[PDB]
RNA sequence: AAAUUGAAGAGUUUGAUCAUGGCUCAGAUUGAACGCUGGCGGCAGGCCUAACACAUGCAAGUCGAACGGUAACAGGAAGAA
């Protein structure tokens, strides 16, 4: 019962000897909704076609995330190409402050409430790249706590 | 007790892509102006330009418990109706 969310749709064209060849590419993005999340990304020669594939894709690819009541554990900063993204932890009531693309992701991410901005190139397919990569990167107080071989009085 | 709890993107270069990069838009705001329209009230605001030139009226008077006074109006007055 994980829910996707489609976050664009493109149509890219290859040329050949009789003209132009149109397809269509679908980026979207699935999660059960409490710290799992993946995007998938299919081109076919048709929009639910691509969708289908993008979806079939984004279903397996997930990771795992350590939220934090609904929040992220401390702020994190998300690179891919073109796109730099920071992403900080919020207290309970403000939603999600953030793009499209990174809405959809800490939405369907299972995040709650998050202080987002995107840098750099807004390309969705690199944002939401940038927006896993900086989400499956933050650690949580038990992980530092095992890796510094002390207890967790930090928190 | 409270008195920083706060951060959104989109369009456009290409047959298509990523990046770079500028232009434009979505938000607030104003001593505002113009166009169409216009019921009431409360609170505020109202020459941003020519520190250009000014008709007219007012905007700095007051004290007789400082003084010599009596010109005006109100009285007291002696004497002539």
């Given at each position: ?32 909704g ?59 009531g ?42 499956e ?19």
């Open positions: 019962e994980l829910q996707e969310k489609l976050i664009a749709v493109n149509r890219v064209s290859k040329t050949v000897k009789g003209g132009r060849i149109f397809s269509f590419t679908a980026l979207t993005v699935v999660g059960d409490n710290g799992r999340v993946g995007f998938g990304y299919g081109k076919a020669r048709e929009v639910p076609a691509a969708i289908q594939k993008a979806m079939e894709k984004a279903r397996r690819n997930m990771i795992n995330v350590a939220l934090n009541n609904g929040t992220l554990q401390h702020p994190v900063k998300g690179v891919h190409t073109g796109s730099r993204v920071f992403m900080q932890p919020a207290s309970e403000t939603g999600i402050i953030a793009g499209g693309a990174m809405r959809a992701v800490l939405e369907v991410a299972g995040v709650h409430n998050v202080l987002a901005k995107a840098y750099g190139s807004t390309n969705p397919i690199n944002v939401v790249r940038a927006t896993i990569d900086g989400l990167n933050m650690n949580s107080p038990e992980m530092v706590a095992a890796k510094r071989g002390k207890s967790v009085e930090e928190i």
